[PDB]
């Protein structure tokens, strides 16, 4: 929102740089759904999508691969978008946010992917720009969670065709929050798996996975709290761009965020306890070794010196040829060992 | 009026007057030589390396009109960065850092700058500095510093200082990477010491860079008539550079604080292994030596008569018992 583009060291002035590490593909897809007819337009050129600024019907423009900085700059210039908005679009490492401008609304959100067999939680930034009667959308890799809205527009289901671009923005944000819900479900599955594995098989890999889950939950916290704040600000006042008839719907989304926030600390609490549990559990394993070792001492270490007490090379030893002295002393020794084993069975060791 | 710093080894005074036509400079301990340049219409850069001598600082203050409080602050090396403004002069304190690759610590120096009329006065503490780029730019006419007034000189000094911060950040990144491979592949206790030292260094960097960001932001937004309206965008550039530095320090602290966790939690399962080896060796040999003592008991009344070869039978019994202990283990695979 500042009047000046923020400088960087080592770059020529007024340079826009992509920050993320995704450069595989690029795509543009335009959906101009009217009250009666809709259009789908997939392309790689950027001069074809630009004229769609002034379409009367609501329009949804989606650009994948913001690694192509020139396309982002061109689309920003053609739509009267601030250079700092472009810098925010191309800066991946920032938390979700919302900024209200006179001509458009700018939103930065995160969508997550979670992979089994590789416990890595990956965040992909999407930028939404509500401008007049159009919705620009900037992803950075192929694939999203907005397919349900696509089928809703394609097959006339729901209310979306009846309404303007504000309802489209609401639909996109609600889809993103539902993706958050399914992410939480996946993390619940993995945390149950981890809890069982830690409680019954403590090794090094379990601790590595537990700390990985800890960092993943921390990142979810850091991305979900600003999401709650921006949904609040979206539904609170928003005079200019969003009609009142829409702000109840945004209300629901806000509620969802609160739930998600609560859940994460539930999860957080569990994993924040899990580490401690692991320590106890691993100590338990060592205890068992203790038990065994203790036993192999108690019935074997003392016997030795009695097996040495009257097993000396001592000239003054009376019981040298006693009547069955060896059998009776060995029987006494075996009795002592048996009764001490029973005594340790009393402690159940 | 006492020098808080503990460094008094070397003292020098170095001055350069410069202009569009030609420049002059000198390196002498004379303190009177700096006085006439107060009246020079040209911009001049006057530096007093040694601030341990209070008399020269007092004389410079009384000649240039520095208020006693900030003059006393100049000697106070233990001061957070700040700014102060006057009707004729402005006063800014910054810090310069020296970091060594081999010795994992950093040293801090308080550098005072005073801007008044056409003269910029620097108060360092010791020889060795990071103003060589701007100094060479003035000497060799490279850049546009000579054309501009005395304020661009202050801008260039702050620019050189932030560039030194950037090279320090490069070194810290280097060491953090090396430490990452180290902790991933060679975890031990001196690694813990090194990580803790690095964390303290980054904490110091953060707590010094944030006041410096405030210094630059105040110097930009306040923009008194002394600081002029022509150096303002350049000060905005320096402010953005400070933003970069702060974000980099923050993420470095995140990484280094995250390094130590898995190693620290990895304890108490090596004790499991030493117990495993201890118990496997004990439960094999100690009962065996007990058996040896029993059948070697010197009682004088035993079946010492061989009958079948007895010594081979006893050795075979020992071997069989050892084998049965080996078999009994790793059935639950705990070892």
């Amino acid at each position, epitope marked *: 929102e500042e009047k000046r583009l923020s400088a*960087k*060291k*080592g*770059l*020529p*002035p*007024g*340079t*826009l*740089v*992509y*920050t*993320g*590490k995704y*450069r*595989e593909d690029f795509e543009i897809e335009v959906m101009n759904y009217s009250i009666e007819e809709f259009r789908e337009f997939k392309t790689t050129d950027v001069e074809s999508v630009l004229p769609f600024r002034d379409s009367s019907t609501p329009t949804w423009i989606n650009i994948t691969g913001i690694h192509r*900085t*020139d396309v982002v*700059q061109r689309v920003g210039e053609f739509f009267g978008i601030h250079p700092l908005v472009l810098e925010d679009i191309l800066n*991946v*490492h920032q938390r979700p946010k919302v900024e209200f401008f006179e001509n458009y609304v700018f939103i930065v959100l995160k969508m997550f992917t979670y992979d089994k067999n590789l416990h890595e939680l990956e965040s992909e930034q999407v930028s939404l720009i509500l401008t007049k009667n159009c919705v620009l959308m900037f992803q950075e890799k192929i694939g999203d969670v907005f397919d349900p809205v696509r089928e809703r527009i394609r097959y006339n289901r729901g209310i979306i065709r009846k309404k303007r671009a504000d309802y489209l923005l609401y639909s996109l944000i609600d889809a993103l929050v539902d993706d958050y819900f399914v992410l939480l479900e996946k993390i619940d599955d993995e945390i149950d798996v981890l809890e069982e594995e830690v409680l019954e098989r403590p090794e090094k890999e379990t601790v590595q996975r537990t700390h990985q889950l800890k960092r993943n939950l921390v990142e979810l916290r850091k991305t979900i709290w600003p999401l709650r704040e921006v949904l609040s600000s979206l539904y609170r006042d928003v005079p200019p761009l969003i009609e009142k008839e829409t702000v109840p719907y945004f209300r629901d989304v806000y509620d969802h965020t609160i739930q998600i926030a609560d859940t994460v600390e539930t999860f957080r609490d569990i994993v924040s306890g899990l580490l401690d549990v692991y320590l106890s559990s691993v100590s338990n394993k060592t205890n068992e070794v203790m038990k065994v070792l203790t036993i192999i001492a108690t019935i074997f270490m003392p016997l030795t010196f009695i097996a040495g007490i009257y097993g000396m090379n001592f000239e003054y030893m009376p019981e040298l040829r006693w009547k069955w002295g060896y059998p009776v002393v060995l029987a006494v020794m075996g009795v002592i060992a048996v009764i001490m084993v029973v005594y340790f069975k009393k402690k159940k060791w | 009026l006492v020098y808080t710093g503990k460094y008094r080894e070397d003292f020098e005074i170095e001055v350069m007057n410069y202009s569009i036509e030609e420049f002059r400079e000198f390196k002498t301990t004379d303190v009177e030589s700096v006085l006439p340049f107060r009246d020079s219409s040209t911009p001049t850069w006057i530096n007093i390396t040694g601030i341990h001598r209070t008399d020269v600082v007092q004389r410079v203050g009384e000649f240039f009109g520095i208020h006693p409080l900030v003059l006393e602050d100049i000697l106070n090396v233990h001061q957070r960065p700040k700014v102060e403004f006057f009707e004729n002069y402005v006063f800014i304190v910054l810090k310069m850092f020296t970091y060594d690759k081999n010795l994992h610590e950093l040293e801090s120096e308080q550098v005072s700058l005073i801007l008044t009329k056409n003269c910029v006065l620097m108060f360092q503490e010791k020889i060795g500095d990071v103003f060589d780029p701007v100094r060479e730019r003035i000497r060799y006419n490279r850049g546009i510093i000579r054309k501009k007034r005395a304020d661009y000189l202050l801008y260039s000094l702050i620019d050189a200082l932030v560039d030194d911060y*950037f090279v320090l*950040l*490069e*070194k810290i*990144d*280097d*060491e953090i*990477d*090396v430490l990452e*491979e180290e902790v991933l592949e060679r975890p031990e206790k001196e690694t813990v010491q090194r990580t803790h030292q690095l964390k303290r260094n980054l904490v110091e960097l953060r707590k010094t860079i944030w006041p410096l960001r405030e210094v630059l932001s105040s110097l930009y937004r306040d923009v008194p008539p002394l600081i002029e309206k022509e150096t303002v965008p350049y000060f905005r550039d320096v402010y953005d550079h400070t933003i*970069q*530095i702060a*974000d*980099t320090v923050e*993420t*470095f602290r995140d990484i280094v604080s995250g390094l130590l966790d898995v190693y620290l939690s990895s304890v108490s399962n090596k004790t499991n292994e030493v117990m495993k080896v201890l118990t496997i060796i004990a439960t094999i040999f100690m009962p065996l030596t007990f058996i040896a003592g029993i059948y070697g008991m010197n009682f004088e009344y035993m079946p010492e008569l061989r009958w079948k070869w007895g010594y081979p039978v006893v050795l075979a019994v020992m071997g069989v018992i050892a084998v049965i202990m080996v078999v009994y283990f790793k059935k639950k695979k705990w070892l």
Partner: antibody, heavy 123, light 106 residues
Framework: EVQLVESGGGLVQPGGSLRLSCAAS????????IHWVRQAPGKGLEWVAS????????SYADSVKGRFTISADTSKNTAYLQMNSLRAEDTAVYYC???????????????????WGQGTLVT | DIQMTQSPSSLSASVGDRVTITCRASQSVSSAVAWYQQKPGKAPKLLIY???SLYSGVPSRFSGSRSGTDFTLTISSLQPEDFATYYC?????????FGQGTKVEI
């Protein structure tokens, strides 16, 4: 879709001046950086110059400092490298390369010469 | 000015064996180093950027690594077309600088 073609080199007596033109197709010079690189045949690559037409900031190698002059005609969408007082070692192939910056940390930025031209001999 | 040293000067090997090339700098550069191929009579082609990141369309057999100021390029599974001349760059400073050049032969 992106192509770079170079023209204006191949032969000139030592001590002269000659300008190499870099024409870019399916690509806009406004939003990217253009690098001139040198390679003597049978030897290694040597960076020469870099121009960012968006601002006009100009970077030169340590070998040809001040000797050369690089510019970019945004309207014509070309990059010009004018070499002056050609020396004995300057006989080499000159390559034109596209540049894009990436992100490592908030303080360090680096660019990669992903696209290259054909490269033209100069003697 | 900053200079980069790329070693070994040459490396002769068959196919199917890991090929490692190392590359260092006079003063440490963070990660702004890139690895390029060069065929005889062909312009260089980017392989690795940011010292560890594969390009688009480059085959995964190539892989970059960093250890402080020591960068490496490795070819775990060589293919018959891999034999070429390999180069570093430095992008940390505004003054780009290459390596000497390492040629892989049979």
């Amino acid at each position: 879709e992106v192509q770079l073609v170079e023209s204006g080199g191949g032969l000139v007596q030592p001590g002269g001046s000659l300008r190499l033109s870099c024409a870019a197709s399916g690509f806009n010079v406004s939003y990217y950086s253009i690098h001139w690189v040198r390679q003597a045949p049978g030897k290694g690559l040597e960076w020469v110059a870099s121009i960012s037409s968006s601002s006009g900031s100009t970077s030169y190698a340590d070998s040809v400092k001040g000797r050369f002059t690089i510019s970019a005609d945004t309207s014509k969408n070309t990059a010009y490298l004018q070499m002056n007082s050609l020396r004995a070692e300057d006989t080499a192939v000159y390559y034109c390369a596209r540049s894009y910056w990436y992100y490592i940390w908030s303080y360090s930025y680096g660019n990669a010469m992903d696209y290259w031209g054909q490269g033209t001999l100069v003697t | 000015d900053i200079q980069m040293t790329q070693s070994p000067s040459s490396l002769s090997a068959s196919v199917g064996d890991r090929v490692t090339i190392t590359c260092r700098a006079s003063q440490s550069v963070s990660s702004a180093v890139a690895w390029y191929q060069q065929k005889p009579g062909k312009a260089p082609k980017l392989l690795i950027y940011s010292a560890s990141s594969l390009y688009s369309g480059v085959p995964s057999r190539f892989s970059g690594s960093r250890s402080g100021t020591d960068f490496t390029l490795t070819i775990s599974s060589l293919q018959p077309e891999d034999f070429a001349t390999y180069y570093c760059q430095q992008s940390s400073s505004s003054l780009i600088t290459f390596g000497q050049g390492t040629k892989v032969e049979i």
